[PDB]
Amino acid sequence: TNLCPFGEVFNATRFASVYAWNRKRISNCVADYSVLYNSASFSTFKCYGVSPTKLNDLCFTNVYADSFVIRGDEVRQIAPGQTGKIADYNYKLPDDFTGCVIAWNSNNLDSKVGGNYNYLYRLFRKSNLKPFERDISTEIYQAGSTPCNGVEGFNCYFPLQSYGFQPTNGVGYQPYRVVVLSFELLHAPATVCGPK
Amino acid sequence: EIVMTQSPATLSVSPGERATLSCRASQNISANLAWYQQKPGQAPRLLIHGASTRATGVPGRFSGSGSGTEFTLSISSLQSEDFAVYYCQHYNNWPPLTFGGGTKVEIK
Amino acid sequence: EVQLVESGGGVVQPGGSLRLSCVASEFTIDDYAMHWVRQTPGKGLEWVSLISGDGGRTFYADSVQGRFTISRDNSKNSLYLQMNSLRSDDIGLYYCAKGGIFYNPSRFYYPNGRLVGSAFDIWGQGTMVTVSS
Ligand SMILES: *[C@@H]1O[C@H](CO)[C@@H](O)[C@H](O)[C@H]1NC(C)=O
């Protein structure tokens, strides 16, 4: 009986930026999903394609944990069939998604007196992201009618802009840390199951 | 902080002749100076974004040139539709943006 | 075409308060750093106020930094300028604008960030305010 490394993922000191979401592959371990649901820290625990109480009763080949940090109002965009900057150009869930999304406030952990500007998100992209697709290229985006030869200009914008996380800002702008647990049974063998 | 100055105060030039407008900046701009034209009774519209890159929907007669401290707007041919006031705005890194004095293009 | 329609400006006695509201039609202003630009009659265009994409970072002109306050509402697609204690120098048209994105400081922009591409391609119609007795 060896528990999965949920503690490292959820209690990591630093969370990767949303534009390049951190991905962790969990397998060959027993996962105690009941512990996550029992904790009241998580503000949002929307689950798609399965009921949380029955979650420990099903087995999956791999569990992909996608960890990032997004502002309060943009956590809504983390849902199948949703539109927005985070949904389209940063992290796109498939319409047929079998998994859960967990989000909790992290105002004290992230925001500072001067403001936490470390986290940054992608503003522009030529085409909408396919499900579970991540792009970290920083080519100078072109808005059309002129190529800038990779030089910032009027219609040529750098794709990445940094969040301003002030300590006393509104609830909408406060930093919410989000982990998306996607359960995938890729083929016949299954290694992840709940405790007996 | 920086000052943008247009050398032509007023250019009364007969239609069908090249027009030259000179814009000078206090600090090195590194080709970050757009141009605007304003006909009376209308809001000024973007004419040339960047030092010389012509903007969308702009006839090819308007052209830009120059870089660094000094920039220039050249009208290839002057028509009855080219009478307006021209301002050379700058969009440098910091947002104390400064416009230009303006040039008066008049008939004959 | 992409439009900006403003309202709320009008004649007022000196020392009064006015609020201008500019509404954006046929596009989104979520990321762009919108400007308020004053064109005094007989004078060239004068940049007055700026707001960031998220509203966190707001800049003002040296003359009107004390009084004017700019806010934005992305959900309602609106820009509000709360003018206070108007002076004789503030008599002129006021234009909404859509400048380039203001990049908050980050790894790529360490010294306080930069304003990239702040050319006003989109201009509103204008709402003239008058400081008259
Ligand atoms: C993170 O640490 C707190 C105590 O600091 C603990 O209560 C919590 O269970 C930890 N998270 C996980 C996922 O174990």
Author numbering:
A (entry chain A): 333 to 528
B (entry chain L): 1 to 95, 95A, 96 to 107
C (entry chain H): 1 to 52, 52A, 53 to 82, 82A, 82B, 82C, 83 to 100, 100A, ...
Quote the authors verbatim.
The Spike (S) glycoprotein locates on the viral surface and interacts with hACE2 for viral entry. The RBD of SARS-CoV-2 S adopts two distinct conformations, termed “up” and “down”,4 and the “up” position is believed to be required for hACE2 binding. Here, we develop six human monoclonal antibodies (mAbs) from two elite convalescents in Wuhan and show that these mAbs recognize diverse epitopes on the receptor binding domain (RBD) and can inhibit the infection of SARS-CoV-2 original strain and variants of concern (VOCs) to varying degrees, including Omicron strains XBB and XBB.1.5. Cryo-EM analysis of the spike trimer complexed with 14B1 or 7B3 reveals that these two mAbs bind partially overlapped epitopes onto the RBD of the spike, and sterically disrupt the binding of human angiotensin-converting enzyme 2 (hACE2) to RBD.
To understand the 14B1-mediated neutralization mechanism, we obtained cryo-electron microscopy (cryo-EM) reconstruction of 14B1 Fab in complex with the ectodomain of the trimeric spike protein (WT-Spike-6P) at an overall resolution of 3.2 Å. Only one Spike state was identified, with three up-RBDs occupied by three 14B1 Fabs. To obtain more detailed information on antibody-antigen interactions, we focused on the RBD-variable fragment (Fv) of 14B1 and generated a local refined map. Structural analysis shows that 14B1 resides on the top of RBD, and the binding site overlaps partially with binding residues made by hACE2, belonging to the RBD-2 antibody in the Hastie’s classification system. The 14B1 paratope buries a surface area of ~1055 Å2 on one up-RBD, calculated by PISA,26 and the heavy chain accounts for ~80%. The complementarity-determining regions of the heavy chain (CDRHs) straddle the “RBD ridge” to dominate the 14B1-RBD interaction. CDRH1 and CDRH2 bind to an epitope on the RBD that faces the threefold axis of the spike, which is inaccessible in the RBD-down conformation. Asp31 from CDRH1 and Asp53 from CDRH2 form hydrogen bonds with Lys417 and Tyr505, respectively. Notably, the 26-residue-long CDRH3 loop kinks at Ala93 and Ile102 to form a hook-like loop span the saddle (β5-β6) of RBD and plays a crucial role in the Fab-RBD association, accounting for 74% (645.6 Å2) of the heavy chain paratope. CDRH3 comprises a series of aromatic and hydrophobic residues at the center of the paratope and forms multiple hydrophobic interactions and hydrogen bonds with RBD, including hydrogen contacts formed between Phe98, Tyr99, Asn100, Pro100A, Arg100C, and Tyr100E of CDRH3 and Gln493, Phe490, Ser494, Try351, and Glu484 of RBD, respectively.
